[model samples]
Target: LPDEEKLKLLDTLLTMVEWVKELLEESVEKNSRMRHIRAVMWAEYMLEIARSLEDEKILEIAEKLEKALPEKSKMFTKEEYEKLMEVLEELEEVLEEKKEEVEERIEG
Candidate 1:
């Protein structure tokens, strides 16, 4: 696979992660269906990246997100949602590190 293509996807995901954080902070109900939907979306993206990179860590993260998803009518508690956000933050850091490494390799 082309690093260029991967880089593009990584950049898009990084932006998306920030947007998710923004949404969480923008008066959206913390325990709403929207939060569950975002969790689903993040899980899907993580699974895609896990397969693309053949990465066990990302696969694990995807599974965690999937498990964190709330039921249709009942959502996470405030504390639980915060914990989920922590998982997302961990993924954000991983993505940033990967991006930096990829950029360095390309530049060097």
Candidate 2:
């Protein structure tokens, strides 16, 4: 990989870690859809890059998502789950746009 690409990947990896840390620190339930969706989507994004490049650092950051999670005390109420999913879906859109922005800059 180009050094620049590797640096960008590390930034992306750390962004995931930082976002997870920020969100998980919020006053939300452990099994909340908002939190886990952010985490799972992040893991997939990080793991995708790691797999393509055979990068251990990205994989390690991805693994942190799983290990840092809290145990679910109980299932979310139906309304709570659905309500949070709505918010998560929107937030994921922002993440997608940010990813595209980075790609554009790299390609530029």
Candidate 3:
């Protein structure tokens, strides 16, 4: 993708992540089950978007998702957590490959 397109996508992805994070925080603060579940679902969707992008920033997003996974699983079920890990692993592989390619290009 062009730099402009990449930036636009990044902005959208980050916005979604931030929105879900805010919702999760608010739900926890308010002690509302419905809000909490909805927040988790939204966060999961955000993770999917991040995975689809395959951007390096996804590693950071994956870290955040991993940190929240246990809590989310408790609130919902283990399935979401499992799926998140699978997606993150796939993204991680792509990131590692990209990193290697960059290193090779730099060395060459």
Candidate 4:
């Protein structure tokens, strides 16, 4: 992708991550139902990125996502944590693939 496209994608992904964090924090302080809704949204967003697998910018976003997870996971059960972990693992794989792809493209 071009620099402009990558920057745009990064902005969108970071915005989504920020929105999810705010929703999760609000839910933690106020409503349990909201937290569940936000978790679902977050998972869907993550899975979307995983499916793309070609966006190198996702690796940076994934780092921020992973750092946020432990704190958020503490609010849920083991089952929920496991489900989120599956998505996170997928995100990690996508990030790694994106890294390799970007590096190879640059090298060649």
Question: What lDDT does each candidate get?
Answer: 0.65, 0.49, 0.59, 0.53
Ranking by TM-score: 1, 3, 4, 2
lDDT of 2 at 32: 65
**Per-residue alpha-carbon lDDT of model 4 for 15-79, expressed as tens digits?**
55446545655665675765756665675575465335454456555554454454533465555
Query: In candidate 4, which residue ranges exceed 4 Å CA deviation?
Result: 46-108
Name the best candidate (by lDDT).
Answer: 1
**Candidate 1, 52-88: lDDT as tens digits:** 7545665566567656655654556677668668877
- Pairs with steric clashes in candidate 1: none
Q: What tens digits encode model 3's per-residue C-alpha lDDT throughout 49-98? A: 66655565665756656565647535634465455545445544554555
The superposed Cα distance between candidate 1 and the true structure at residue 16, in angstroms, equals 1.0
Q: Candidate 1, residue 106: CA error in Å?
A: 1.5
How good is model 3 by TM-score? 0.56
Which is the winner by TM-score between candidate 2 and candidate 3?
Answer: 3
TM-score for each candidate, following the candidate numbering: 0.72, 0.43, 0.56, 0.47
Instruction: Name every residue pair that clashes in candidate 3.
Output: none
lDDT of 2 by residue, 1-108 (tens): 664675566466557545644554342556566665565455456556544544443344434433433335433354554444444343344444545555666785
Determine which window of 10 residues in candidate 1 has minimal summed lDDT. 23-32
Higher TM-score: candidate 2 or 4? Answer: 4
- lDDT of prediction 3: 0.59
